[PDB]
Structure 1
């Protein structure tokens, strides 16, 4: 996608993460499971919600009766009335069709952007304490218990606390 994450370097989705649009999967010694990122999800929900209401509510039509009646000697104005109706028909149809197409595209990109940013936000925290193993996963160079994992999801990961352990395992693994 526009930003390369969804259907990109994160190849597929998670039917197991049911509580949010974007989120996290972890596996450590004490367990494994999914957790939605609640903040980024709510924010995205707020954006799309606002978008839907805009497309719907900015249309404020008045009370009208479309039909018009003309006698057999009023064909010219009957064709004018039809030209009006057909002109309106053509416009709304073109504009609605393109509108939906354009915003659907903008919507998918948006999700794509959001995932990338989440991934980047974690990478920026983890730095050299983990290995980017592709497909959106980071493999930690140190033991990460449930407390540690949560700090990452909450954005308070302590890089210096684990940097030593990681450096040992990083230069050990890289021989």
Structure 2
């Protein structure tokens, strides 16, 4: 959609990452596996709960009877009251329905940016040190152990540390 990540450059979901909305998959000499990005997942639960409450919280409403009884010689007031009942009904049905359609689009668009910003955040860290292979993947031009992998996921990737190894591998691949 809107940010190009979800169902865009990152084709599909992961039934393997069960600990969060957004995260990572890795491969190294030690092993593979999925992990959720805590910082983004949490903030997003926090914000989505806020949005969910807001739609519900702001309602409040009065103590109302709704029903009114009118006699055989009070059809005009009885119809006036149905007009009030029907008019509010049309207001509430239309708004509820439009609010939900517009906000469901805005929610998915939000999950798209979260996944897009996550890709970009890493791309900014690794720079020259990894190859962007598409599908939201990076192929490290250097040896990236569970520790190194964790540094990236935690947003503390040390680019000058792996630079030399990555420059020689890249320069050999590009050769």
Q: Deviations over 1:7-29 (max 9, x none)?
A: 00000000000000000000001
Displacement of 1:95 in angstroms is 0.5
Displacement of 1:132 in angstroms is 0.2
Gaps of 5+ in 1: none
User: After the TM superposition, which segments of 4 or more aligned residues of structure 1 sit over 4 Å from their partners?
Assistant: none
What CA RMSD, in Å, does the superposition of the two structures yield over aligned residues?
Answer: 0.4
Q: Deviations over 1:103-131 (max 9, x none)?
A: 00100000000000000000000000000
TM-score, normalization by structure 1: 0.99
Distance 2:3 2:145 in 1: 32
Distance 1:146 1:95 in 2: 50
Distance 1:49 1:163 in 2: 42
- SS of 2:35's partner is strand
Distance 1:110 1:165 in 2: 37
Aligned pairs (5 A) from 1:70-81: 70-81=70-81
Displacement of 1:62 in angstroms is 1.1
Displacement of 1:149 in angstroms is 0.3
Distance 2:157 2:118 in 1: 14
Q: Deviations over 1:73-111 (max 9, x none)?
A: 000000000000000100000000000011001000000
TM-score, normalization by structure 2: 0.99
State how many pairs are aligned.
175
- SS of 1:60's partner is coil
Pair 1:6-2:6 in alignment: yes
Pair 1:161-2:157 in alignment: no
